[PDB]
């Protein structure tokens, strides 16, 4: 099993961590001490990630209050040992990870069986120090974490010696160079930014004239603006001539950690929130004081909301400040109000805080196992005090926060009973049931959100469960693959908290325009707020627009590998998701794709397009030509690529295969065309020694002169191009004939083919720049030469019943030849242009647009969302109380900012909210009266009334049609069915005679 990773399970996580880090993880034995909510959350993430084994220690009996955040305990478990009852449920998370229970820790030498030891808040500070001393002195990595109500911390001690092998997890930077001067000044090609920072290291390739500079030697970077950097003298290597590519290399970094005992008096802090810098040292003394309080008082924490205990904690912190003078520093007084809240909340057990630290700490465990990413060094403290409701609405005292003998006692401890009841009675829509959705439903189950008679949860997701989902969608099991995500998730969390039984309406509908009959006005209007758990801009933007329309708050969030974000959208207050979006990533120039690739990303895009044309569009165009009597006529109206469409039909029918041998021949001939003849044609038009107008080499920089390929069936890429191409063609034409192709079989067919020789077309123009005109446009064909191709098409009557079967691209079925073809095809073109070839996993990442994902980040971001949710429940209108988050666990880095206020505008002298305000019109008004009323009371000379894309009115004949009739007219005579409201968008002029931006209209039918 050594060295093997199950890519079909770990696919998305492999794109975060890499194979080497996971191989180190699969050798590491982890021990977690304490299996309340914090411990089980950490264990859940580490077991999903795949370590060698997980061992849990917790002999304490389950009590009902433990269920606040321990999602694997049930009321039937009370009195049993937490470790014992949790082991079997953790074991079900990942069959590759054995989960054991450690019965006793009296003998500390047992720790020597483990590589990483995690001490949660069940471990006293006295025991944490003893355990850390044993781990530190033995070479065992040590991590501890504690949560106390809305506060928490983590401590990391990986020993005297630890090597970071990759500090960031980012793709290495690369770039093309146009000069390296004798002093090492490197000039970037054209406008290309290097993207490097001082102190980075690079190696070089293709630098002609400097020979051994390309041998993998590393050079330390001194940046000289964003388009040049310096590497020190290169005189010893020669004299630059031309060419070159730099590649950033991450070098190992040896670091050293101090023990817990040393760090108690002289801590090294990583801050979680730059608005709260000064709180870290205060909380550092406070968390210690809580332990001292417990040793005084028979192991008990301060009493909930108890002011006597709080005053005692403050004195403990004061005394400790004198013993630990370097913590606060000189002249800094104890923040007594802060310590008071810590005392008041010490017993609290809050799902969002547990999820935040569970995700952070589990990732630190994986860093400890692997050397991947930069460990936290060494203390981080956190609070989410902004989550507290306004005491005017929900007073906090010993009466309101007292236990009621329920699983929620330690959330009540913080928020009070009435606030928890308001959570129970909340009405929420969750859009999506994947990674964030599953974690979200778990958090809500622990909150009891929707368990109240007036509350409920709706969750919708049209997708089914797939194997790779299981790595981070922890409510799903191997047996659940193929079932509907939302339905399985709802059932799973109601087992975790039967209080939610019957309160989760699991739907399998896709959210978007086509389901507004389902998600109608009554549906949205009833909601308290909406939570997104989506993975695409279209769905996120659509939900955002509904939330704006219905003025519902929206909780947005996302992850990308180790990075994540949260966004709070509040009606009449903040920007929305849509207005905050970033302009799209610039696309690859078409000439670069078509003729001058220089990165594997370019050859993969090209190969994916060829795949689409060969095996999807070609088949569809045939079927349409055979089925629609007007196809040819339509194809000149619709056009786009008339020449290409008609040629594909003619090719598809004239060269139809009769057996599998015919498909092999076809694929071998396409190999010759794409990787030999077309390349000789390019070189005919642009000889290797050709010059531009200004006498410089045409083939320089981003233009890499290719060499045609001579087919070699022992080259893996040539072989698999033909295998995959033939199999997909055989699929197209319903031919049948092996998962293992036989090289000798294929070789016998190909060996006996006659391969047409290349003859150049000497009258072609190939586009060099995208600014230049397009030689291969419909305008570049001619209205006369298409007739030949049309009349040469066989009439459908000669092909009765003939049908081609189009391929639907599926990146995640490794037996279907899709990624095989794209990888081989890409790599053959990479061979043409001397680009390094890529394996199937990288090709699948790019061609499939897979998003790197891991449960640690998913759980952490979800925790942060639920800390903002508390603020919706209190109807907070102070924008300064909300927190938009950005996280990068690689670093680790945490940043928070208050949301951005909605832009405000003026159609002069009237102030409006450019996002949330609109004109509400009662009734199906006649067009003329609507135009009038804008002049009457809004003083607007309306100039463009549009419904969706079309313009119902434009000043560039005359209508007295009620809007509902007007829309029918211009939308090909369709009848609105369930529509009670209609959104219209206006362009207008103001009383001063000037065009103004104006809010949209709602027609209430
Ligand atoms: N318009 C929509 N309506 C409802 N659910 C949606 C919509 N668009 C996307 N989703 C859901 O959002 C969820 C996003 O979760 P996530 O991306 O973790 O899972 P996934 O897409 O199956 O995994 P992967 O991206 O790794 O294949 C998906 O389950 C997806 O079905
Ligand atoms: Cl390359
Ligand atoms: K020519
Ligand atoms: Mg400098
Ligand atoms: Mg999916
Ligand atoms: Mg997805």
Numbering used by the authors: 10 to 746, 750 to 968, 976 to 1024
What does the paper say about this structure?
In the presence of Mg-ATP, E1 catalyzes the acyl-adenylation of ubiquitin, initially forming a ubiquitin-AMP adduct.
Somewhat surprisingly, two octahedrally coordinated magnesium ions instead of one were observed to interact with the triphosphate moiety of the nucleotide. The triphosphate moiety is also recognized by R21 from the IAD and R481 from the AAD which interact with the γ phosphate and the oxygen atom bridging the β and γ phosphate. Finally, K494 contacts the bridging oxygen between the α and β phosphate and the 3’ OH-group. The 2’ and 3’ OH-groups of the ribose engage in H-bonds with the carboxylate of D470, while the base interacts with the side chain amide of N545 and both main chain atoms of V520. Comparing the contribution of the two acidic residues revealed that only D544 is critical for ATP hydrolysis since the D544A variant was almost completely impaired.
